[PDB]
Amino acid sequence: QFAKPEDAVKYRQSALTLMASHFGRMTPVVKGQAPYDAAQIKANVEVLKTLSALPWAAFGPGTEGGDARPEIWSDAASFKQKQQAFQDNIVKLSAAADAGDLDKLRAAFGDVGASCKACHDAYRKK
Amino acid sequence: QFAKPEDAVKYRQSALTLMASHFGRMTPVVKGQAPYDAAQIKANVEVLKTLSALPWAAFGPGTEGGDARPEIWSDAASFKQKQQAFQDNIVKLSAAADAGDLDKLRAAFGDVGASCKACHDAYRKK
Numbered sequence: 129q130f131a132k133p134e135d136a137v138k139y140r141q142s143a144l145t146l147m148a149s150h151f152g153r154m155t156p157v158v159k160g161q162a163p164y165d166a167a168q169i170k171a172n173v174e175v176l177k178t179l180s181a182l183p184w185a186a187f188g189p190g191t192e193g194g195d196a197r198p199e200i201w202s203d204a205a206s207f208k209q210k211q212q213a214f215q216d217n218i219v220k221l222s223a224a225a226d227a228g229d230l231d232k233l234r235a236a237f238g239d240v241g242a243s244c245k246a247c248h249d250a251y252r253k254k
Numbered sequence: 255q256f257a258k259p260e261d262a263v264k265y266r267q268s269a270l271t272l273m274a275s276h277f278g279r280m281t282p283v284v285k286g287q288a289p290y291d292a293a294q295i296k297a298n299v300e301v302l303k304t305l306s307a308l309p310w311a312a313f314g315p316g317t318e319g320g321d322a323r324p325e326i327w328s329d330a331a332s333f334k335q336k337q338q339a340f341q342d343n344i345v346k347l348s349a350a351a352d353a354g355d356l357d358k359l360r361a362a363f364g365d366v367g368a369s370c371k372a373c374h375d376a377y378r379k380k
């Protein structure tokens with residue numbers, strides 16, 4: 129859906145920005161600094177699930193640019209493992225949110241955050 | 255979820271960018287320049303439905319900035335009518351996509367596009 133590489137870059141950066149907001153806005157809830165409303169969190173994690181599937185299709189071959197490292201494309205299998213693993217961490221978060229289980233939510237939230245960082249360490253420029 | 259107005263601005267601009275891509279990428283399909291795969295379009299419109307609900311919460315009071323016109327906030331009811339009308343145009347598009355009905359898809363796609371423009375004409379700076 130991208131006329132030029134720059135359009136793929138803009139798309140993925142926007143998708144990742146929205147992910148970061150839908151993830152990060154739960155930090156006060158996880159920490160107990162804001163109240164836990166199970167329905168609110170269930171709905172928010174549903175949005176995050178949808179968003180978390182979006183960036184990867186905008187790293188199609190030849191879409192070097194932005195702060196993407198070239199290693200994304202020199203080993204397509206390893207990058208795919210990282211995004212699939214990330215999305216399965218999001219599945220655990222969804223399951224916790226759907227269950228209304230704050231303890232499971234906290235644990236899953238930490239694992240999701242670790243998975244964001246694991247990808248950045250390998251694939252995002254400083 | 256926004257520490258400063260700038261964070262709301264960045265969020266809504268990213269959400270609108272993603273909407274524009276999920277909407278605009280169907281133009282060749284509507285025009286018959288690309289093939290119509292009912293399942294592909296159903297899935298894409300589901301994504302668009304989710305995204306189309308997101309920008310509005312990031313025009314909270316005091317989040318003037320970007321290319322948002324101040325009229326968004328001086329008549330909250332009228333802005334809300336426009337975004338709700340837009341989302342109901344998206345509902346028609348969803349219904350068409352879910353039905354696998356290309357004629358209804360075309361018609362709904364045109365009405366959605368008109369609704370984007372109607373809001374821009376009133377509420378987006380040149």
Ligand code: HEC
Pocket residue numbers: 137140141142144145147148151193194195196197207210211214240241243244245247248251252253
């Ligand atoms: C690889 C499988 C990634 C996972 C998982 C996550 N992110 Fe990431 N992110 C990745 C790359 C390669 C890039 C650079 C994209 C580019 O072309 O520039 C990024 C970037 C971001 C950004 C900045 C977006 C922007 O506005 O330019 C943010 C805010 C971001 N990423 C956040 C984020 C969070 C919170 C994640 C887990 C919930 C996450 N990313 C996962 C690669 C990957």
Ligand code: HEC
Pocket residue numbers: 263266267268270271273274277319320321322323333336337340366367369370371373374377378379
């Ligand atoms: C009002 C109810 C709107 C509807 C419906 C749509 N858009 Fe719009 N859009 C609106 C505003 C007020 C703004 C400015 C936001 C800001 O603070 O700068 C915009 C902006 C866009 C953009 C630019 C985003 C960016 O990268 O800065 C795009 C690409 C865009 N809008 C597209 C778009 C499409 C395709 C719509 C219908 C499917 C649509 N918008 C609806 C207000 C409203």
